[PDB]
Amino acid sequence: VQLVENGGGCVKAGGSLRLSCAASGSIFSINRMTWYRQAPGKEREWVAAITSGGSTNYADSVKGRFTISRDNAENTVYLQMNSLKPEDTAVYYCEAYGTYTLAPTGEGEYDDYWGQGTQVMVS
Amino acid sequence: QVQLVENGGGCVKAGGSLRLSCAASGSIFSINRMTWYRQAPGKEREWVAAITSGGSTNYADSVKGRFTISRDNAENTVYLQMNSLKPEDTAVYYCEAYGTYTLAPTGEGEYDDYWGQGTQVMVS
Amino acid sequence: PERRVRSTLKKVFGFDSFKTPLQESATMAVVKGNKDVFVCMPTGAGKSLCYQLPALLAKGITIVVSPLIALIQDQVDHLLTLKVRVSSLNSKLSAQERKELLADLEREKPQTKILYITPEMAASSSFQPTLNSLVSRHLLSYLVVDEAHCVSQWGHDFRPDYLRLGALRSRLGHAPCVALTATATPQVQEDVFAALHLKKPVAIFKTPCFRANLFYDVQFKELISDPYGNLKDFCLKALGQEADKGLSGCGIVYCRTREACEQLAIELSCRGVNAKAYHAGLKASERTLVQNDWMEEKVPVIVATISFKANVRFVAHWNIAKSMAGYYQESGRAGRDGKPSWCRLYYSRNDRDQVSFLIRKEVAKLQEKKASDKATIMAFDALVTFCEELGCRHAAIAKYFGDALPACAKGCDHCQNPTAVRRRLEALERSS
Amino acid sequence: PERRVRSTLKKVFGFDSFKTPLQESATMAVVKGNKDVFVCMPTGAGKSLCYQLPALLAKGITIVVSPLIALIQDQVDHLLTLKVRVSSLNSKLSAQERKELLADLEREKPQTKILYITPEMAASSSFQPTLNSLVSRHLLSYLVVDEAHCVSQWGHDFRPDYLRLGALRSRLGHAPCVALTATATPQVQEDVFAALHLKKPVAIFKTPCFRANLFYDVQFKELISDPYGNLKDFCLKALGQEADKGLSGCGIVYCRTREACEQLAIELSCRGVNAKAYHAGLKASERTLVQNDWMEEKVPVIVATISFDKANVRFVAHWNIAKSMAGYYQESGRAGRDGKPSWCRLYYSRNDRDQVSFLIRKEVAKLQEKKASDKATIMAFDALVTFCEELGCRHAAIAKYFGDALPACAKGCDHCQNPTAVRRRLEALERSS
Ligand SMILES: [Zn+2]
Ligand SMILES: [Zn+2]
């Protein structure tokens, strides 16, 4: 099971924009869906996550920047930036922590799956 | 060990131009050839171009009309010059540095290649 | 390699091949030891063999942890009668025996292949220097945590020492882990993964809930004109697959109140079908007599009540089980044999209220002595929804146990006549 | 672990400690077997042990390839006298003996711990089923390849069968490999890496070439008014470190023509320093007698001509620049081979450079008439010429051409000691030339 990113593009200042991270395969449930910033020559840092049951966790600047919403039944998560700025510009990656997959044969996987990156810049 | 980094990545309008620079970290004697690779979300990796020691260059005709690669071994840096950019070449560009050769006074070395982080680009 | 696994199986297990293909896959993964593994099979599935075979195959020592010392002794005896070497670190063991075990563990390349230690002793300081020596010598090969559901307070049973067993696993991380459970709720599975500190990637081996020979469906008391007649019809239909076969198999009826089960048994007697109350009010000798009579064909369907055969035709549920896991366990009693079996549940508004009140009383009693009571209430609500769900029943059971949804083309109440299920739900909504 | 390898070496080689920390690292990497290892050392550095130890350490029947059958026999005997299990599948083996070896390799649990086979033997159809069985049963622990430089045509040695050895490496890819070489240039190293198809992640263990005890310096005959006097002064300063120490060590001088060495020796004797030509024209008995005399301190500097070795030599004068830069390094290596400090001096001249270039071109043309080797030797000569004319750290140029780690010679390097003097000499050469 791999993660796929969609909706990546550079938008001018003050322009909202939507990213989508979708899983592949059949996963019964995901413990949480977390996102990670990344910059050239910079380790990947966590920003926010959405957990099943309506629980979600952000940071101060992260919360002021965007809002995330993940769903296990849909098996996908969506990030929405409002009032984007040149300061917050970095490629994004997906955690998929506690991705619990299984098949009718009973063989499953509890590993966290990372997908490709999606970059965004602002004038 | 060697670390690669991209410099000069940004989205520009059609017909614009810029440069994507790739370097190395640590003590490297000479890279066999630096081979960029273009890969985007939902797009398979494609051999985009390559530069080897001595000045010999390899590339694709479409990419040639799009871009052009050129590297220096002494500097150990490869630059991909963006000119007449188009919205089709929107894939993340990873820097291979095929055939890295490392040296130390102890004699221990590393022949493995080191891939950089890369950076994408978009056009109106 | 697989050849070594089969040789060991023939040696310690005496079996030609693994009883369950899922068990074989889990044992192969454990032998590989590339990463931790989580496993959940019902009683008698062979998880003991699953975590015993790799320990013998592995060159290093395996450390098994089980909550109850009686189970540790039982497994030690089962390994002793077999070829695999085993030892026990029970505190009740004689001081000489404890010293001998400690010396064997401390000695390099200990003769023991699998070593059992109760969580209380594992967390004790006495076992600390031994573990330090083993990790220094990297002698430990695998860490098996049996009844791993005890860590999750939401599971059926709980053990406070598993919080320390998690850090125990934290030590000697090079040795893979094998977390075994009897019934793994997906929330309980995640809790076990997090508490025991298993590595993020793990291969989960869970036995699917669906059985091609088992059937599930719920008939509402308000929907049915007479629930007694419906129960009689279900008993008669499930007792014989074909008219030529005739009366065969066995039947079971469950209820909460022993007096209610006795009332049900007398009502079945009035109908004409032989039945046995087998309820708490019935004396112990009469209880065994009723159970026996049920085991023979003399009693086509008898009331089981609280207490529990090689082949049971069906499992009727007069009163819906307070715990959905309890309902699944009761259903498993039916269809244990290879022949087809059917399961029916009696859910009604009055019955729903009665079971809700009983669950509330149980939760209050438990609180008088949070997460465990919360899990019990969640199971009760899940069972209620399953009785009132609109979809496949096997799929709902699997979702509650958090395994892959079934491919039930046949043998599912919703699949056979989805329109009938929709009409029944509409009638229930109109009545309620 | 370290104790295991130490005990194995004590049992096999009987060495209390490893020859060099590079050997420690190479043996550790080979034993780990995580990936291929390219380890290169000069002759006599016990490079063979780096693969002999892990081969016995691993349970799998390791297999190694060497070009020469005399060589393979020598190493087999050296391992036998040390009780190390070893066998050879060469064609020299009798029919019955060859069949016995083939059966032992084919049958499970091979008795041989390390098996040496000539490159052409692996290409032989008879051994094909054997290799198939070993790869199927993962019986090949490690696949070392002695004299890996033979795969590359640029190296001093070349073998067409190393190309097939590369495909053989392509087989049994699960097991790692060990690539040995006496003297491998970075181009040769890259060629060996590419031809052998070694797993790309490889730990390279190549001994650095700088000699803290050794010192290098280039001289220009045209610049010096009296080159003979300069050579005499260098000999006088080198033969004695201190007044109390007195005369010590030896000396050697090279040349392309026997008459040139004879004239140089005559001039040296006329100056006062004893020196014998020791040229090829000198008869064998006379040549060996001269070599023995130069071995002692009786002759402060004896002309070596084509060939010398000696335990400790103070200096090595190069009246005529060598044919290959690697050849020149090897000629200078015997100088200061011991731990005592030494001083190396070159005598580069435009006329000599042109003469050697013309001779090398003629030799390359003759070889082509009977191509890659000619280009490689021309490149080596060009590198030597650049070293002679390079106005920078000499050890740095040596490392660059040999591709080993650059040096950190704070002392003992002419360029690093007085770079202004090097610039002045370069300017003088430019003005003269
Ligand atoms: Zn269904
Ligand atoms: Zn220097």
Numbering used by the authors:
A (entry chain L): 2 to 124
B (entry chain K): 1 to 124
C (entry chain B): 12 to 319, 325 to 385, 389 to 451
D (entry chain A): 12 to 319, 324 to 385, 389 to 451
Provide the authors' original text about this structure:
Furthermore, the success of DiGbs for high-resolution structural solution is enabled by their relatively small mass contribution to the imaged complex while increasing the maximum particle diameter for better particle alignment. In summary, our plug-and-play DiGb strategy improves cryo-EM resolvability and resolution of small proteins through constraint and increased particle size with a simple and robust workflow and can even enable simultaneous structure determination of two challenging targets in one dataset.
To probe the applicability and value of these homoDiGbs to cryo-EM structure determination, we tested the 49-kDa DNA helicase RECQL5 as a challenging soluble target with both small size and substantial interdomain flexibility. Next, a larger dataset of this RECQL5:homoDiGb complex on a 300-kV microscope with standard operating parameters yielded a 3.79-Å reconstruction of the complex after imposing C2 symmetry. Because of minor flexibility within the DiGb interface, imposition of strict C2 symmetry prevents refinement to high-resolution signals. Therefore, we applied an approximate ‘non-strict C2 symmetry’ that improved the alignment of the particle images. In this way, this initial map could be further improved by forgoing strict C2 symmetry, with symmetry expansion and local refinement of RECQL5 alone improving the resolution to 3.18 Å.
